[PDB]
């Protein structure tokens, strides 16, 4: 039976059958529960809403994300998101379709085990696998060698790879991604009095972030230009028709990827952690990693982020190195496209966790087989 | 059928058909096995890389040499190097081509026996021979009389010969060669902080040794000049484009051939062991050995090594003796060229170990026929 690929990343679920070119279900990984009284009978007033249901009801629901920093914190609601994914969006019974899950690297083994338990005992799926998202992102780019930089909603991670052979000591994960960008955008939009505080408003500032923000090529000079002229200001219309206007916030928001100290995060920036990841690699392969930076994940979609990243690594890396960044279109879906490739690859059919292996070895099996 | 010459020296295999002017396969005698976790599909089915392939993948492989100090330590990998030599590089079936192997003198008889077993029972070769490398090095020069100095990757040896009649008591072997020079170059490059520790880095310091190093004509005055001026410093570019600069290390590395105490090796230097080898010879022939020092092997390629050797032996030898050193171009390949001559010499076709003789006498035959 045709395999099933379900990228339970943070923020958005991407799911669909293997071998398809694009995920046929993309919806937010949100569970919303009614915030107010239940005044009006004659309706189901149902206890919970998920995905686009929750977005369509946003302003009366306490929205929550059950996966946080790539870690599933709330299995009772994540199991609702998987139920919705399989039965309502994909409209398929998982007990016929082996499911390729995926997760970020350097992640608690309790997550991979609980995902295994849930898939094999709640959804009875015939087989399962848990690929590293960055490894998938090479499949989606046709590469066999490169650093992958995946930057999601909840986590950002670097994984260097060379003709296969991921270098596990050179993997880095940053815990800085689109939620920290949204919350910092809210904090700086407070500087001119657009008070956003509810999760519905957090979900609107996510849209403001996606529509308006871009990454400055030269942050000091863009900041000086936004200080000297209004040319960088853009206007946006809130759901109630209130216009807001935004200026240096427009690039100060995604700049925090390159300057995490803006959110008080101590770590090196994403360019510095990319360089330090290449510096953990053996000196022979670094030239091909510089020649094969692959960017993936939604927070790599900012205009100019590839240009800024190339400038910053060309400033870090030795002057001879041909720093190249593979940041294609649809790089937002590249982790799913890589799973769609891998799950439909003829040789991968050896790799599934069969339910017989789960009945023999319990949750511990998924540390033995999966990388 | 045209004979086959396969110089399984240390470090580089030189192989090719007899009668050719130069070996058509020259590649490193390296077997490399993956060091890291193979995460992608499209690997691991192949699990061992040989020769130039191991160099092309250097930074993910634990490179190993299966022949060490001219002694084959790892027959399972040496048999891979022979398989690669015959089937992938020369693209020939050995069961049609009698193979002239060669090895250093004063070498464990177990090696010559295991080479015989492998050639006659794994590769089924019609016939085989194991010439002493220094005896071969005369043929490439056209001498009948001379000192041969062979200085390889793993061993250095002196073999005096006079109209024939190698003097077996005057043979000397030093166990000091290009690997000890590489490792000492790594140790002294540590003195200014280029930490090389992996075998990939050992393989880069081999390149630094080949590109930059030279033999000082007057080591004390060259050391003082490198101390007083930067004129002797040279810059080299690592595979990742990091520039390094090298100074007195440039000649301190190959100086250890003349001063083995630099690597803690007790023995007399190569000039002293050359002189002592002539001094083991009968007093009538010494004048022609002084007139016919033949230098061969890759570690004789250093600029100025012939001039330094001539100075040192002219200081050792009696003032009348016309000390002359035959260090031609291509002396790196002179052992193979000598094998290409010998294997195609019509007088030599008596000398092969035939497979009938091996079926009659086992590995012991190669001590009876070969010198």
């Amino acid at each position: 039976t045709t395999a099933l690929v379900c990228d339970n990343g943070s923020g958005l679920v991407k799911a669909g059958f293997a071998g398809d070119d694009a995920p046929r279900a993309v919806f937010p990984s949100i569970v919303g529960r009614p915030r107010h009284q239940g005044v009006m009978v004659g309706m189901g007033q149902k206890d919970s809403y998920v995905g686009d249901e929750a977005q369509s009801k946003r302003g009366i629901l306490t929205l929550k994300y059950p996966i946080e920093h790539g870690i599933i914190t709330n299995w009772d609601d994540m199991e609702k998101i998987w139920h919705h994914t399989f039965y309502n969006e994909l409209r398929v019974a998982p007990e016929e379709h082996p499911t390729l899950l995926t997760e970020a690297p350097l992640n608690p083994k309790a997550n991979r085990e609980k995902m295994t338990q849930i898939m094999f005992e709640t959804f009875n799926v015939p087989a399962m696998y848990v690929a590293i998202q960055a490894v998938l992102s090479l499949y989606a780019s046709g590469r066999t060698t490169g650093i992958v930089l995946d930057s999601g909603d909840g986590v950002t991670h670097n994984v260097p790879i060379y003709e296969g052979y991921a270098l596990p000591h050179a993997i880095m994960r940053l815990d800085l991604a689109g939620r920290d960008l949204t919350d910092y955008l809210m904090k700086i939009l407070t500087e001119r009095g657009y008070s956003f505080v509810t999760t519905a408003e957090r979900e609107i500032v996510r849209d403001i972030k996606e529509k308006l923000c871009y990454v400055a090529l030269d942050f000091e000079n863009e900041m000086a230009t936004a200080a000297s002229s209004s040319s960088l200001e853009k206007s946006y219309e809130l759901p109630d028709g209130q216009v807001i206007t935004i200026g240096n916030e427009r690039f100060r928001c995604p700049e925090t990827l390159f300057q995490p100290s803006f959110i008080g995060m101590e770590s090196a920036g994403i360019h510095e952690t990319t360089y330090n990841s290449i510096m953990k690699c053996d000196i022979d392969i670094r030239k091909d990693l510089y020649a094969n930076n692959v960017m993936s994940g939604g927070t790599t979609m900012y205009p100019g982020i590839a240009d800024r990243m190339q400038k910053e690594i060309t400033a870090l890396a030795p002057s001879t190195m041909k720093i190249k960044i593979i940041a294609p279109p649809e790089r937002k879906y590249s982790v799913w496209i890589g799973g769609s490739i891998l799950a439909s690859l003829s040789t991968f059919q050896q790799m599934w966790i069969t339910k017989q292996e789960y009945d023999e070895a319990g949750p511990s099996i998924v540390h033995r087989k999966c990388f | 059928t045209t004979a086959l010459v396969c110089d399984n020296g240390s470090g580089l295999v030189k192989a090719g058909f007899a009668g050719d002017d130069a070996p058509r396969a020259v590649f490193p005698s390296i077997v490399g096995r993956p060091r890291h976790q193979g995460v992608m599909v499209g690997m691991g089915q192949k699990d061992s890389y040989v020769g130039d392939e191991a160099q092309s993948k250097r930074g993910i492989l634990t490179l190993k040499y299966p022949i060490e100090h001219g002694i084959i330590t790892n027959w399972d990998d040496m048999e891979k190097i022979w398989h690669h030599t015959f089937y992938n590089e020369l693209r020939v079936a050995p069961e049609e081509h009698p193979t002239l192997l060669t090895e250093a003198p004063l070498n464990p008889k177990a090696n010559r026996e295991k080479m015989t077993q492998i050639m006659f029972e794994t590769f089924n070769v019609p016939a085989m021979y194991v010439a002493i490398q220094a005896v071969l090095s005369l043929y490439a020069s056209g001498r009948t009389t001379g000192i041969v100095l062979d200085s390889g990757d793993g061993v250095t040896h002196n073999v005096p010969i006079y109209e024939g009649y190698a003097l077996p008591h005057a043979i000397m072997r030093l166990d000091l060669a290009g690997r000890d020079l590489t490792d000492y170059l790594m140790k002294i490059l540590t003195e200014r902080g280029y930490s090389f520790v992996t075998t990939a880095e050992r393989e880069i310091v081999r390149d630094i040794k080949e590109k930059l190093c030279y033999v000082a004509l007057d080591f004390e005055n060259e050391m003082a000049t490198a101390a007083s001026s930067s004129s002797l410093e040279k810059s080299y570019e690592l595979p990742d484009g990091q520039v390094i600069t090298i100074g007195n290390e440039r000649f301190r590395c190959p100086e250890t051939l003349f001063q083995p105490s630099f690597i803690g090796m007790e023995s007399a230097g190569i000039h002293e062991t050359t002189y002592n080898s002539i001094m083991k010879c009968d007093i009538d022939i010494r004048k022609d050995l002084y007139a016919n020092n033949v230098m061969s092997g890759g570690t004789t390629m250093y600029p100025g090594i012939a001039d330094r050797m001539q100075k040192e032996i002219t200081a050792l030898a009696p003032s009348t003796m016309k000390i002359k050193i035959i260090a031609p171009p291509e002396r790196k390949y002179s052992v193979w060229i000598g094998g290409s001559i010998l294997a195609s010499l019509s007088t030599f076709q008596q000398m092969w170990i035939t497979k009938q003789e091996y079926d009659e006498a086992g590995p012991s035959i190669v001590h009876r026929k070969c010198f």
């Binding site: 398809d20 294609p328 279109p329 769609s340 490739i341 690859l345 | 599909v41 690997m43």
Partner: peptide
Amino acid sequence: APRRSVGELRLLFEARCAAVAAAA
């Protein structure tokens, strides 16, 4: 650079895995 489908990308890894299986 132009797009290429999941079919073509699969064909890349199929051809590579065949190449290594022949090399093995």
